[PDB]
Coordinates of C-alpha atoms and ligand atoms in Angstrom, one line a residue:
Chain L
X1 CA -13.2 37.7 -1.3
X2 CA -11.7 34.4 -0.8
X3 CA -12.6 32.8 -3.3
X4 CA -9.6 30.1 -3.3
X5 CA -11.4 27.2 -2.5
X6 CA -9.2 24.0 -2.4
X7 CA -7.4 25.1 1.0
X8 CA -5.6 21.3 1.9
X9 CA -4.1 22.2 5.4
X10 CA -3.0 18.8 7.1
X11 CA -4.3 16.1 4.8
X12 CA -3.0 12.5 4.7
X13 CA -4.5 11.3 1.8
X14 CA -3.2 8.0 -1.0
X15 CA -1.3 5.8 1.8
X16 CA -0.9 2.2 1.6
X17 CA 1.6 0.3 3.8
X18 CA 1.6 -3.3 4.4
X19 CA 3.8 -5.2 7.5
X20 CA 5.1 -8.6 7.9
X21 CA 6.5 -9.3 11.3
X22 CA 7.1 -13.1 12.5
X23 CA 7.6 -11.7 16.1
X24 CA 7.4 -8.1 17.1
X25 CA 8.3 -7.9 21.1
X26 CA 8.3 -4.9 23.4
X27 CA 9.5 -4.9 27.4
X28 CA 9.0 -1.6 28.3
X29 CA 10.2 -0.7 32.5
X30 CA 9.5 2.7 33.2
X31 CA 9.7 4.5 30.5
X32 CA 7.8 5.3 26.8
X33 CA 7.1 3.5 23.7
X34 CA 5.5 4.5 20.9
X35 CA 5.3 2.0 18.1
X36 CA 3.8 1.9 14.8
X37 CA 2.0 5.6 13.9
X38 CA 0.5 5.5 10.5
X39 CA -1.4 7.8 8.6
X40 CA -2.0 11.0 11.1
X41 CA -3.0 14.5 9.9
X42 CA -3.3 17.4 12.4
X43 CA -4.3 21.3 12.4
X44 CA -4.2 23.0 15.3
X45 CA -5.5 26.7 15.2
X46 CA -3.7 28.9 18.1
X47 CA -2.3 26.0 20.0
X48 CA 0.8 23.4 20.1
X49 CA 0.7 20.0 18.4
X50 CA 2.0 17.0 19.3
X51 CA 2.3 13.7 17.4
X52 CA 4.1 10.6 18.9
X53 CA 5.8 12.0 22.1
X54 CA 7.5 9.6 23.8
X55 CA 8.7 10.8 27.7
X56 CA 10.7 8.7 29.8
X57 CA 9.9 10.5 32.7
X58 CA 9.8 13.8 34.4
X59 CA 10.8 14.4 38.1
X60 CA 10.8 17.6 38.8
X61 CA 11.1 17.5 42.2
Chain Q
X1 CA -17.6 36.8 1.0
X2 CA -15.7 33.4 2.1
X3 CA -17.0 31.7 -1.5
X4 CA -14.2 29.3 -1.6
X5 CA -15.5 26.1 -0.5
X6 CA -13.5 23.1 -0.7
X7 CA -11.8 23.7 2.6
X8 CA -10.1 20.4 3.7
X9 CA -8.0 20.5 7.4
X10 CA -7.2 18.4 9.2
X11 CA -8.4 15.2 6.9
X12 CA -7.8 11.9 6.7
X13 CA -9.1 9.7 3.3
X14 CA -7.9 6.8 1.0
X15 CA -5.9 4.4 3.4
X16 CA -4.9 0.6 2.9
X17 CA -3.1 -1.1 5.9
X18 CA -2.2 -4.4 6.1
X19 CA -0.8 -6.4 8.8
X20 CA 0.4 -10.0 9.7
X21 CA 2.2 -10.7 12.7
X22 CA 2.6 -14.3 13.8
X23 CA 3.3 -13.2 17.6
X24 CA 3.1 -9.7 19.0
X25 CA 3.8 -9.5 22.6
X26 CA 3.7 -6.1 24.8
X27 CA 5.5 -6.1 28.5
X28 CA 4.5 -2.9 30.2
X29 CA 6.0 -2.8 34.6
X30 CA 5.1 1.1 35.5
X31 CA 5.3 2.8 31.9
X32 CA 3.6 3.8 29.1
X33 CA 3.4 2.2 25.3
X34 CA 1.4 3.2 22.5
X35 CA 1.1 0.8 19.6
X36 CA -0.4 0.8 16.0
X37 CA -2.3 3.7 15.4
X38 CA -3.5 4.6 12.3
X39 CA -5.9 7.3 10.1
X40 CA -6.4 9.4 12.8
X41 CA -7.5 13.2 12.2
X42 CA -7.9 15.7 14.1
X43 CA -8.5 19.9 14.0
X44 CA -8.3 22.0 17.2
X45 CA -9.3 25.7 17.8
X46 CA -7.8 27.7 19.9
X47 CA -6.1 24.6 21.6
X48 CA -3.8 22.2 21.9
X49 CA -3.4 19.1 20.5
X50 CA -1.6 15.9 21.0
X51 CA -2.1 11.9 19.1
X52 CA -0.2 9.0 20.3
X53 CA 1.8 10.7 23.2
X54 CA 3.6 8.3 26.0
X55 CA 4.8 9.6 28.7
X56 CA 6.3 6.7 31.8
X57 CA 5.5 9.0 34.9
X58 CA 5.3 12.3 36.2
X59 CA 6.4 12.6 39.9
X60 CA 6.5 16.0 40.6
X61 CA 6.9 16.3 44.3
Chain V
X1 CA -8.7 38.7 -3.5
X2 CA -6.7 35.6 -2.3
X3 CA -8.6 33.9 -5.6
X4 CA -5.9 31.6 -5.6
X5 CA -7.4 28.4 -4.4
X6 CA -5.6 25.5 -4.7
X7 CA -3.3 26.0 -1.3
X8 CA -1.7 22.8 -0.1
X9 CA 0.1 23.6 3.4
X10 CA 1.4 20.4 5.6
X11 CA 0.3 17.3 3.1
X12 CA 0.9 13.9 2.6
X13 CA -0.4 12.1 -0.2
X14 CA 0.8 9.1 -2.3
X15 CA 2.5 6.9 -0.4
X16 CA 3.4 3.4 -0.4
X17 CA 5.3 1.6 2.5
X18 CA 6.4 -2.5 2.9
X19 CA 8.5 -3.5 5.9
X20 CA 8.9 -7.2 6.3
X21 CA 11.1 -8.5 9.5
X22 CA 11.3 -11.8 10.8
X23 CA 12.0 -10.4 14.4
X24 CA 11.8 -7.1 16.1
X25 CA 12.2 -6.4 19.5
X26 CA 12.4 -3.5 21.8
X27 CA 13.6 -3.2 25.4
X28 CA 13.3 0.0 27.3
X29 CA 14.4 0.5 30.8
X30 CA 13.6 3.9 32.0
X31 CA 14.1 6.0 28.7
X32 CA 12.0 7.3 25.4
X33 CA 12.1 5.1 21.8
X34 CA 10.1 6.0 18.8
X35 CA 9.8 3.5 16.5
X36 CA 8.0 3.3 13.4
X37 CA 6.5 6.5 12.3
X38 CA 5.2 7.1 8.8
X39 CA 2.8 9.5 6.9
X40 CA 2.5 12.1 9.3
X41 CA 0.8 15.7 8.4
X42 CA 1.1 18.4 10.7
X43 CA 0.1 22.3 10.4
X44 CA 0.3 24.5 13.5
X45 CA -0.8 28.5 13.4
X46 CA 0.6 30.1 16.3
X47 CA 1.9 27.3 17.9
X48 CA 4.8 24.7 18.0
X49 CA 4.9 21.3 16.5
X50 CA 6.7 18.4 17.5
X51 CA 6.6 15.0 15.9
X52 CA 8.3 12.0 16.6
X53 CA 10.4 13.5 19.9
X54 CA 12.0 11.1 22.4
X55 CA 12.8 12.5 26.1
X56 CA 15.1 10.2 28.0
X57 CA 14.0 12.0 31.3
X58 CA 14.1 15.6 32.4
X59 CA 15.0 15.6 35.9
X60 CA 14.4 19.4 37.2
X61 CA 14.7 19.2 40.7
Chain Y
X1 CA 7.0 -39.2 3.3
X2 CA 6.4 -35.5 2.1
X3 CA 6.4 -34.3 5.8
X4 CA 7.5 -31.0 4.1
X5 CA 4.3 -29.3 5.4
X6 CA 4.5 -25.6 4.4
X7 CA 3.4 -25.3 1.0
X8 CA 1.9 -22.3 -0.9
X9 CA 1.4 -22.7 -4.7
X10 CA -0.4 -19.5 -6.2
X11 CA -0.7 -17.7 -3.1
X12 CA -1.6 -14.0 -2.8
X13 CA -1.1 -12.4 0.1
X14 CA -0.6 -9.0 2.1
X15 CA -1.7 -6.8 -0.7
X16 CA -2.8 -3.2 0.0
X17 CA -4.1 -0.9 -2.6
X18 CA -5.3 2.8 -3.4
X19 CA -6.9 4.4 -6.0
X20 CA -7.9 7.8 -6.6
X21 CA -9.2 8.9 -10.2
X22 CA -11.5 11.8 -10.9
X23 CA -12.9 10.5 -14.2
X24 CA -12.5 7.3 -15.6
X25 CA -14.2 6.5 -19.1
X26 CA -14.2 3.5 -21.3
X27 CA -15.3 3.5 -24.6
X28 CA -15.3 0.0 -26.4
X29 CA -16.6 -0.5 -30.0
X30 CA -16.6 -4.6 -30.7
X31 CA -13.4 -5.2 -29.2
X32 CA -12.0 -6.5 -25.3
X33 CA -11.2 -4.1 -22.6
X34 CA -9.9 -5.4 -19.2
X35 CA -9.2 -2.7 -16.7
X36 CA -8.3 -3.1 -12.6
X37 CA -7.2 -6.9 -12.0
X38 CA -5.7 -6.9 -8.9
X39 CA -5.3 -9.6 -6.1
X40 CA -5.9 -12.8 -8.3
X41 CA -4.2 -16.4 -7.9
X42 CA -4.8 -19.1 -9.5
X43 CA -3.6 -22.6 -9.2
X44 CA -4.1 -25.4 -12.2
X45 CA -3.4 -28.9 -12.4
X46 CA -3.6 -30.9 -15.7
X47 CA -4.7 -27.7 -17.7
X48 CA -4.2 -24.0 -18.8
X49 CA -4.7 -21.1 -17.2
X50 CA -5.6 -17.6 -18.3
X51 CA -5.7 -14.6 -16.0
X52 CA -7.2 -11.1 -17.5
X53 CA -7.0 -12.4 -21.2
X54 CA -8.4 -9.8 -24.2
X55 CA -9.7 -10.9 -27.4
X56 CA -10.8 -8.4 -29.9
X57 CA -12.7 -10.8 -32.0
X58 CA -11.7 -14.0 -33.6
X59 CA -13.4 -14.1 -37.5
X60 CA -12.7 -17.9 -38.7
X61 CA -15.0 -18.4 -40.8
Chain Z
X1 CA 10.8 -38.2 2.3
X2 CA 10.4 -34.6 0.8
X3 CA 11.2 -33.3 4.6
X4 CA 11.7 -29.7 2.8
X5 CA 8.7 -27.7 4.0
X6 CA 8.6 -24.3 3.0
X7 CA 8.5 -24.6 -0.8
X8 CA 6.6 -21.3 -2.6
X9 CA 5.9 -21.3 -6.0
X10 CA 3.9 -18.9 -8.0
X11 CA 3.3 -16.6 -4.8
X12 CA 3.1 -12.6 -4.3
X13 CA 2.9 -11.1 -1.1
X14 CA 4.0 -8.0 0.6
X15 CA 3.1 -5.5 -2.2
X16 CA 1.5 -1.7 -1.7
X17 CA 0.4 0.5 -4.6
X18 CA -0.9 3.8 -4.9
X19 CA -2.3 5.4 -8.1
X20 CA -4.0 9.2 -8.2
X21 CA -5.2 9.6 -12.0
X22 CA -7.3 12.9 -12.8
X23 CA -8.4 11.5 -16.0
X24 CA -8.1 8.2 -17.5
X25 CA -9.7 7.4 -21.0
X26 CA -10.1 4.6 -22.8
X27 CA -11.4 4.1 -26.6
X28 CA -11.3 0.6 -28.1
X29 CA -12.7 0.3 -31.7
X30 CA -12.0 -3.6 -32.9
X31 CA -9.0 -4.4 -30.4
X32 CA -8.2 -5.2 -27.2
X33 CA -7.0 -2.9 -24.2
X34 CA -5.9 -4.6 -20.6
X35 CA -4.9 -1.9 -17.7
X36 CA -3.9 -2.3 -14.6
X37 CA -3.1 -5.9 -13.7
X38 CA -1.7 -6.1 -10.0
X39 CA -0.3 -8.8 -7.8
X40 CA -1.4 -11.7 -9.6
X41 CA 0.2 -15.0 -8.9
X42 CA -0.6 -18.5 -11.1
X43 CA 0.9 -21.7 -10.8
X44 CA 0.4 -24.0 -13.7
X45 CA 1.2 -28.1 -13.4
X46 CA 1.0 -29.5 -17.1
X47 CA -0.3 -26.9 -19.0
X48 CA 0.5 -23.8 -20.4
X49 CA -0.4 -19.8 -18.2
X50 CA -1.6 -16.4 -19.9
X51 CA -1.0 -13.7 -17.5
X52 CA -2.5 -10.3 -19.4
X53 CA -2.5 -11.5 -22.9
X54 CA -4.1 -9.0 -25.6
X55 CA -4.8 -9.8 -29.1
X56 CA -5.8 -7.6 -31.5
X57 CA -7.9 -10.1 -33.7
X58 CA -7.8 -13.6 -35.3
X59 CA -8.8 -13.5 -38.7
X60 CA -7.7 -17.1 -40.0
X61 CA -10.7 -17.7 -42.3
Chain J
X1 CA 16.1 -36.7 0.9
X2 CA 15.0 -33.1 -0.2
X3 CA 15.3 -32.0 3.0
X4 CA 16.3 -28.9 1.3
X5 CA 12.9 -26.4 2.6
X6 CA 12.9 -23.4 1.3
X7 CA 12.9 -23.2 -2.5
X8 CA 11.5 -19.9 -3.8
X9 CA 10.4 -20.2 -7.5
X10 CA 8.7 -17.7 -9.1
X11 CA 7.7 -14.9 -6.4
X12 CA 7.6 -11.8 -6.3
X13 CA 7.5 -9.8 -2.6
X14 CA 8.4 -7.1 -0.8
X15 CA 7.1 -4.3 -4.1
X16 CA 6.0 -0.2 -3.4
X17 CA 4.8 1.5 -6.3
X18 CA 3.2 5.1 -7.0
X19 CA 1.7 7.1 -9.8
X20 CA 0.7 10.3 -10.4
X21 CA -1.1 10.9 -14.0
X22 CA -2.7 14.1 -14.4
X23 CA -4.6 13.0 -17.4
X24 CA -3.4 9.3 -19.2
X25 CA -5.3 8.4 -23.1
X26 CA -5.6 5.4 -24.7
X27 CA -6.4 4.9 -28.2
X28 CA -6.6 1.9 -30.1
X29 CA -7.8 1.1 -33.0
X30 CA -7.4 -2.9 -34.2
X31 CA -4.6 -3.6 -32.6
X32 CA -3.6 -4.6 -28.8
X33 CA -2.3 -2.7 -25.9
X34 CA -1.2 -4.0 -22.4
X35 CA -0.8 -1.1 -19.8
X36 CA 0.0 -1.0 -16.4
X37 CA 1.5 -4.8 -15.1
X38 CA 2.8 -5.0 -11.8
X39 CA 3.6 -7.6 -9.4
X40 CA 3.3 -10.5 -11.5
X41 CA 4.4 -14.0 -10.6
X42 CA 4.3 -17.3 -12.7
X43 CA 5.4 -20.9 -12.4
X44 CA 4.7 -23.2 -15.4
X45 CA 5.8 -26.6 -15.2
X46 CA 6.0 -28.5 -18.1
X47 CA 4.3 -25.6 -20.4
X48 CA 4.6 -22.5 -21.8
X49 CA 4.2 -19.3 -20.2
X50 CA 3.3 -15.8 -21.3
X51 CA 3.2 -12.3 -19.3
X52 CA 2.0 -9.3 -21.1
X53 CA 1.8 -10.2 -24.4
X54 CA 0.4 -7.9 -27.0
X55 CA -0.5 -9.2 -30.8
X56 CA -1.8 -6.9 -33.3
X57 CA -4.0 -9.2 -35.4
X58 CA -2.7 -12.7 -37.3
X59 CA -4.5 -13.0 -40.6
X60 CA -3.3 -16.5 -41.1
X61 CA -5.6 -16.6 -44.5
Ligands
LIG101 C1 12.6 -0.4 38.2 N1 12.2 1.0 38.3 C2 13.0 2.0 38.8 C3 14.4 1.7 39.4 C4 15.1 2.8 39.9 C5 16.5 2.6 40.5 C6 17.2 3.6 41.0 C7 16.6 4.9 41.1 C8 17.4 6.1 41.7 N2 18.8 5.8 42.2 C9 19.6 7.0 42.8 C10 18.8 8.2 42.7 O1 17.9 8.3 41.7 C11 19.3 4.4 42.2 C12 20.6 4.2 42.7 C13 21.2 2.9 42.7 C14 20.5 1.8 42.1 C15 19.1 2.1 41.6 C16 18.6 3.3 41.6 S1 12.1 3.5 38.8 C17 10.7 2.8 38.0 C18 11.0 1.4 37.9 C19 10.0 0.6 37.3 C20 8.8 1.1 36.8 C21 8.5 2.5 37.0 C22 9.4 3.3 37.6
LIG102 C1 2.0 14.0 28.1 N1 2.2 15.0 29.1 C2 2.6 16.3 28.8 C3 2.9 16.8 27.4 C4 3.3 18.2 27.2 C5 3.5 18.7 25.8 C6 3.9 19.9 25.6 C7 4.1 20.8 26.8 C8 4.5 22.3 26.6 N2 4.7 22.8 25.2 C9 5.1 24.2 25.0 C10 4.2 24.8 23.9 O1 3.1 25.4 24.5 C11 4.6 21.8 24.0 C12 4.8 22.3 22.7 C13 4.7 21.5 21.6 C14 4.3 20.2 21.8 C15 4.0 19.7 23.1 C16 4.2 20.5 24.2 S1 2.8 17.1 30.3 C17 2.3 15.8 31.3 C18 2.1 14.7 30.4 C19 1.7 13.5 30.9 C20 1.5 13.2 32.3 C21 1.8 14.3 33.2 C22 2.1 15.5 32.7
LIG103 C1 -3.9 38.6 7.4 N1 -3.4 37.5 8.3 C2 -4.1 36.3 8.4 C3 -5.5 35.9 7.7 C4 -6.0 34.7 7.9 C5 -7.3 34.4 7.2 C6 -7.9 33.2 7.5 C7 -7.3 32.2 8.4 C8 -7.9 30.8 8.6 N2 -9.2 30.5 7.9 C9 -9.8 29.1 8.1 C10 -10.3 28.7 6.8 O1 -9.2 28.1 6.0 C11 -9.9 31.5 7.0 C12 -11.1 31.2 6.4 C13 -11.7 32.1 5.5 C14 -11.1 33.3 5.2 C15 -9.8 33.7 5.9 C16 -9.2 32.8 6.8 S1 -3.2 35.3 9.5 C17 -2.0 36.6 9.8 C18 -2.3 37.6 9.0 C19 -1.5 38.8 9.0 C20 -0.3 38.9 9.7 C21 0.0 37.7 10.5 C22 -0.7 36.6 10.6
LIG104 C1 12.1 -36.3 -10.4 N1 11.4 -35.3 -11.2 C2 10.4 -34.6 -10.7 C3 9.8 -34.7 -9.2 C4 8.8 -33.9 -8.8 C5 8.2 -34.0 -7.4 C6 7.2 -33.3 -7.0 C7 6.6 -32.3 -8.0 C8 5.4 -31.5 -7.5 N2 4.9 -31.6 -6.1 C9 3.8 -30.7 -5.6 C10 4.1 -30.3 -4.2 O1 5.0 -29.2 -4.3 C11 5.5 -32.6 -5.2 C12 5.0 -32.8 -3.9 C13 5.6 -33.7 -3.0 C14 6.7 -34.4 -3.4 C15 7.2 -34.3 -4.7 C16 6.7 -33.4 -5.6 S1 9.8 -33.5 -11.9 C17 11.0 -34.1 -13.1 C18 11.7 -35.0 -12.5 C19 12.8 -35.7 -13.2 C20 13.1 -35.4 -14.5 C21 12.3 -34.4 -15.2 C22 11.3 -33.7 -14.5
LIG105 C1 -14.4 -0.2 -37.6 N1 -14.1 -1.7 -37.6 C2 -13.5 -2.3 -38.7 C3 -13.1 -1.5 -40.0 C4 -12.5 -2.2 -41.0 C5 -12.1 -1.5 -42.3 C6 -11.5 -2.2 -43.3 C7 -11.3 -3.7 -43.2 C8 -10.7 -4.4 -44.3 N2 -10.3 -3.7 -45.6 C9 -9.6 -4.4 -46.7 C10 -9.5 -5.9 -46.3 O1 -9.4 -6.2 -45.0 C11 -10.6 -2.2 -45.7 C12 -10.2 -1.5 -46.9 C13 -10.4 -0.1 -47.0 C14 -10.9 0.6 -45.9 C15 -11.3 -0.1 -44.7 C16 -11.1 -1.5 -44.6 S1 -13.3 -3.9 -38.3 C17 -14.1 -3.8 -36.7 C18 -14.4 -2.5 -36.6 C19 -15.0 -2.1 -35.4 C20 -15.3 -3.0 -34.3 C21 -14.9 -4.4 -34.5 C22 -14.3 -4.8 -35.7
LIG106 C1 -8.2 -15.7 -25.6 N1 -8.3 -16.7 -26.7 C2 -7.3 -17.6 -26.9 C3 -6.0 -17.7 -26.1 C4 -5.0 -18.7 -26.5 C5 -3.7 -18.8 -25.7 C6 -2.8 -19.7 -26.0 C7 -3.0 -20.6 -27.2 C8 -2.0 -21.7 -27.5 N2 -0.8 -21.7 -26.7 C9 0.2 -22.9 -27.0 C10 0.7 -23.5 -25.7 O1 -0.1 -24.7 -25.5 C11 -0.5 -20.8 -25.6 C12 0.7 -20.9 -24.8 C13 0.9 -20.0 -23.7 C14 0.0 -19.1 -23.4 C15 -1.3 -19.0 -24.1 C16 -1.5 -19.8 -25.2 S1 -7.7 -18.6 -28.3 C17 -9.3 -17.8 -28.5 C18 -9.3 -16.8 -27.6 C19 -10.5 -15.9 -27.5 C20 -11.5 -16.0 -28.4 C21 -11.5 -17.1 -29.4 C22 -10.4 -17.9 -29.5

């Protein structure tokens, strides 16, 4: 009997956000960038979770 | 007897976003970038899960 | 029983955010940047959980 | 010569808002309400200016 | 020669709000209520500016 | 010569603002109540200027 009902399990919820930028500039040369994450809910059930992952890179050779 | 309703995961609700950039330039030679990303949800079973992931390169060989 | 309902587990809510710059810039050569992350929810069962993670470069060989 | 080009007078701008209310209630009995003014200019030349102004009654008699 | 550009007067910009109210209740019998004035800019040349004024009542009989 | 540019007079910028009410009551009876002012700018010239002004009642008989 699970009668607990309001369960919130990765909820974003209430966001404002404003920005002002006169000049944003990115040079990206082999490599990652990750710019401007906002707002993101995840559940994941029997698995990994991944949320703005930047890699450079992997050789592995 | 699951009576509990109200089961929220993995939800995204009630976002403002504002955004005023006079010049926004992006330079990408053999990489990865990942820019403005916003009220994204998102609810995996038995699974994995990734938002927003860069990576530059794999070369595995 | 598990009659108690109101569960909140990996929540964001009430949030207010202003960034104002007159100049941003970024210049990657061959590594990982994360810039800019804000209002992120996450909730992982049986599983890892990575947010906001910058690899230079994982070599391996 | 007023080259001076740029000018804002009673400028709104870059606003971001959120609200979230389960029961709002407003009972008025022969007076003024003013509820949720947001976002407003105004710009007046050679005369007054009232934004969200409340007058219960005025009798003058 | 009024070269300088970049006058502001009277301006709002760059503002984020966030309000979660369960219940809000009003009652108003023969008065005057204001609520929840936000980013509100006036500029007034020669004259006089109200911004969220709230009288009661004018009897002057 | 007023190349002098940028003259900031009455602004208001750059403002993040929460609240959480589980339950907020109001009452009023023949009188005046201002509630809840944010982010207010003003620029009289050559008058008066009032920001959240609350009268009771002038009899004035
Ligand atoms: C430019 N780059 C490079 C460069 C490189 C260089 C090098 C490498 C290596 N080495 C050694 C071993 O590793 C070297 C050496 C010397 C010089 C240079 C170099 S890599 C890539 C790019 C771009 C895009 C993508 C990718
Ligand atoms: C992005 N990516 C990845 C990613 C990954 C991630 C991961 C892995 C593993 N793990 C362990 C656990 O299961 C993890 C964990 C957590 C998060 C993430 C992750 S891999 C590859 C890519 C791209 C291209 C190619 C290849
Ligand atoms: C008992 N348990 C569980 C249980 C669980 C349950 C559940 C989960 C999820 N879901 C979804 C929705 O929210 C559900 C649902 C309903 C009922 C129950 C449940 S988990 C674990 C244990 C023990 C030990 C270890 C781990
Ligand atoms: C000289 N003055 C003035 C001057 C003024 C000018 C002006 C004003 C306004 N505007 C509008 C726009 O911003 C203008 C404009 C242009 C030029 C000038 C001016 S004011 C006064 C004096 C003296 C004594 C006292 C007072
Ligand atoms: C209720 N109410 C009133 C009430 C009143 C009462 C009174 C008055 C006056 N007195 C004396 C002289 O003034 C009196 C006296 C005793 C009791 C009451 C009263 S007024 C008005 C209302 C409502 C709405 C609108 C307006
Ligand atoms: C609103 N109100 C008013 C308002 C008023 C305001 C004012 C007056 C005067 N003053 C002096 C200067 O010129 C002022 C000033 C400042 C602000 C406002 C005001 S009056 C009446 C009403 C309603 C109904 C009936 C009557």
């Amino acid at each position: 009997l699970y009668v607990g009902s309001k369960t919130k399990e990765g909820v974003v919820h209430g966001v404002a956000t404003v920005a002002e930028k006169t000049k944003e500039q990115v040079t990206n040369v082999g490599g990652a960038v990750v710019t401007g994450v906002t707002a993101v809910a995840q559940k994941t059930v029997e698995g990994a979770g991944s949320i703005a992952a930047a890699t450079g890179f992997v050789k592995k050779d």
